[PDB]
Design a protein around this ligand. Structure first.
Ligand code: ANP
Ligand code: ANP
Ligand code: MG
Ligand code: MG
Lengths: 492, 495
């Protein structure tokens, strides 16, 4: 019933269930350490809290934190940082970090650091730590009170989502199947965007398989550089996708409201999109609609890949076929209706980097579909003195016409691209963990039927675990409601 | 493995069990709210923490705390205090304190207070509040994470107790079956006394039934005025009772260590009041003590007393009487020396002796130094009025004489109103018994800080005796030492 953005009723909305009510749920869940204790953000935090009870488990976690921090530590400070780690967790007089740690392994480590503080050094130890944690600490965790607490959060996570989970605000823009508008979760105060697809227009244009595809892709992907789906639910008129709120406008807007960007800036965006594409390809997803309009900015000026309607899964070992995408941005293979896995995407990245610098698309101004397609297949892109050599270098290697020889497709994937000298200045680990400030910060822009029922049920699955659990942690609902034994403890 | 007093290993000694380990224990335990959520100190706290999650449950607890506070509030401040409670929990515009509270009840309360802030005013509301808490909140609690936590605490409570649970320190004194010495719990740092009974001497003197009786009485009683039994366990040589440590000496020592034996009234009166409370607590459990004398009242560090040495105590079944000349010669009542039957009247007579002796510096029917033969003492007990001096104010003499009344039917404490008869004597005019009862009045004397440092039958009996930790003292121990608060808390550690 309606009226830091949180409802006055939030504590009730998130009131925990009884323990008994979480029993089916226990037996229903998959017994997988990696998911329960690393991926699910709340599972991770509760497992950590379990570990904090025991000194041996707690030094493992401290060590894992030690590494994660060392991995994103600037190149100049990184040797001392790793020196600190060994002195504190690998001392020949200290306690063994984990049972039966191979002691040659530790000697490799010691001396591999002494010559080269590369960010891999602690990989084997990391992997043996998780290995250890995964067995007995895990079994104990499951039989601890901390897992009861986890089941209680999981139960909340799986509760029905309806329109009454949210407040709606103003329309943000219009999309082929409905509007997109700003919304806010009542329990937590967290803002999102909400894309509506009207059941009428889906059924009329029969875009069921395609709308379902966009949703399933969005939920499987978990990337700082791709818009996340937090929730998927139905109204009486529509299917909704609640998504990361990207309020800084897209790149088409930003290139052209002057046209073009200083190198530093264009490079920063290319690096982030490159990560987004890495994250996507890791999940075996080819995006296929990379263009400036589909890259949105957030309030701090980081970007994300948006609109995944044309994306598709590429099964292991196979290729797929299909001319789809926008005319000026489609790669040679695609326009020739040849078979591909991932190459189209790296071609688009080139166009997009090109267009960011040139203030213009490399094969389109408008010119007729035919002639643009001929230029794409047969004609070299033209550079001006707006491109430093390295910019031109990367661009042409990405806008290479043969996909076999195109950067990002020669065998090393995203790392090929990342290693181009144009990015010499940027630390990808830090970029990937969101620790590098963007060059540009946008303007704070204001806010204030059996078939079909079968399809709607497959679609409207409700809360998505990782973003949902994240939402709870970010808004501090987790911290405030999770705690225990502080409230009626101070006597009368 | 040995080396604020807590062992460095304390966190591992108290490490919680797995939840599955608590399952039989769940089903084993009796589903009783009063015990689980009021008497067991840790169950009470966890139930309160459960309540804190829900505003309606938490107002009830606030109310109960409100009343508890009002009950111990000095006479002058008590009306204001109660006006405050009404305004905050019975407002005609406020939310209902509990479902279906009868509104006439509330009107009676409002206006009763308005004319007399008596300490019972909120009793019907209190009762109704527990009544409400004991059904649905209680069922929810049971099915909450907070009970899981209770079960883990209970499991720790029921773990085996051995000599390795404690450190032993110097001998304190020597008892008929063994020594008594100071000990300390390794996990918590809490000090106790430890009374050893040697299996040899018990078997030789056959004092099995009596040693078991003392132990079972000690563990049933729960009084700020009686020594508590916190643990009972066995050694290879002995049976042990771990007891509240009373280090301030006994009253026989304190009465006679002057040169000029006796206490100023205030002081004697304070002790009488505390002993009187301990006797009420015993009698409410249907226990007649039967060995009240000055040597059996111990003082603690702060100078509060407790009744000690319950070997002659006995449970008096409902409606029946008991028989038996037991006790010490000059403190036994007329009934008892005539081998007549009694329930509780012997104890009030002893209180009379004890008060008399505190003031007179002499027992009323036996002498300090040169002692009178059993038979004569017994004659003076039966037949001769005790003698007063100008050392007794009129009211002291009044109380003493009413307690040392020879016919137990007319003796104060036994006319029908029990301890309350005694408590209402004018001699206690100045003392607030609710406060006394909750430990809030400072004693007039604080003792010297006195140092501390350094077979099938039988095995069946040993098993009946060595039951380990006693719940309420145990859970209290965990709270006072702050092991409960530190270990119980959750979701702060790797957050
Ligand atoms: N996460 C978001 N945050 C803020 N605004 C958004 C978000 N997603 C979409 N929008 C806005 O909504 C507009 C239309 O949505 P968009 O997703 O681009 O199209 P669509 O609904 O996927 N169908 P189509 O555009 O034909 O493929 C965009 O131009 C954006 O301005
Ligand atoms: N709770 C305690 N705290 C400190 N000292 C105590 C405690 N209980 C007993 N003692 C000391 O141990 C002595 C002997 O204990 P006590 O309970 O007097 O003997 P007993 O074995 O019960 N036999 P009796 O007392 O003659 O019936 C007491 O006088 C005190 O010196
Ligand atoms: Mg669009
Ligand atoms: Mg003794």
């Amino acid at each position: 019933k309606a009226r830091k953005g949180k409802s006055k009723k939030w504590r009730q909305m998130l009131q925990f269930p009884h323990i008994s009510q979480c029993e089916e749920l226990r037996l229903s869940l998959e017994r997988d350490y990696h998911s329960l204790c690393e991926r699910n953000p709340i599972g991770r935090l509760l497992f950590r809290e379990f570990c904090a009870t025991r000194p041996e488990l707690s030094r493992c976690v401290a060590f894992l934190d030690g590494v994660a921090e060392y991995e994103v530590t600037p190149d100049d400070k990184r040797k001392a940082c790793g020196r600190n780690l060994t002195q504190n967790f690998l001392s020949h007089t200290g306690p063994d970090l984990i049972p039966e740690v191979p002691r040659q392994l530790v000697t490799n480590c010691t001396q591999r650091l002494e010559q080269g503080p590369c960010k891999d050094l602690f990989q084997e130890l990391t992997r043996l730590t998780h290995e250890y944690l995964s067995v007995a600490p895990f079994a104990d965790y499951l039989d601890s009170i901390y897992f009861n607490r986890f089941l209680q959060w999981k139960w909340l996570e799986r509760q029905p989502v309806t329109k009454n989970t949210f407040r709606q605000y103003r329309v943000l823009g219009k999309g082929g199947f409905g509007e997109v508008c700003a919304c806010q979760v009542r329990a937590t105060g967290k803002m999102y965007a909400c894309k509506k697809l009207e059941k009428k227009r889906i059924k009329k244009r029969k875009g069921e398989a395609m709308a379902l595809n966009e949703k399933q892709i969005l939920e499987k992907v978990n990337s700082r550089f791709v818009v996340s789906l937090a929730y998927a639910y139905e109204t009486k008129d529509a299917l909704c996708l609640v998504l990361t709120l990207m309020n800084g406008g897209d790149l088409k807007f930003h290139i052209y409201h002057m046209a073009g960007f200083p190198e530093a800036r264009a490079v920063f965006y290319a690096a982030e999109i490159c990560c987004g594409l890495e994250d996507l390809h890791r999940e075996r997803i080819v995006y296929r609609d990379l263009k400036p309009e589909n890259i949105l900015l957030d309030d701090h000026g980081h970007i994300r890949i948006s609109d995944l309607g044309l994306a598709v899964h590429v099964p292991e070992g196979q290729t797929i076929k299909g001319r789809v995408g926008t005319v000026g941005y489609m790669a040679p293979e695609v326009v020739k209706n040849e078979r591909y896995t991932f190459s189209p995407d790296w071609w688009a990245l080139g166009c997009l980097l090109y267009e960011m610098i040139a203030g213009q698309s490399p094969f389109q101004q408008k010119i007729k579909r035919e002639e643009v397609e001929r230029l794409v297949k047969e004609v070299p892109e033209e550079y001006s003195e707006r491109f430093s050599p390295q910019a031109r270098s990367l661009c042409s290697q990405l806008l290479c016409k043969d996909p076999a020889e195109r950067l990002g497709c020669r065998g090393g994937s995203a790392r090929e691209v990342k290693e181009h000298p144009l990015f010499k200045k940027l630390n990808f680990k830090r970029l990937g963990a969101g620790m590098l400030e963007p060059p540009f910060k946008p303007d704070p822009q204001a806010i204030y039927e059996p078939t079909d029922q079968d399809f709607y049920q497959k679609f409207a699955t409700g809360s998505v675990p990782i973003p949902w659990q994240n939402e709870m942690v970010e808004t501090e609902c987790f911290q405030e409601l999770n705690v225990f034994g502080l409230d009626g403890s101070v006597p009368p």
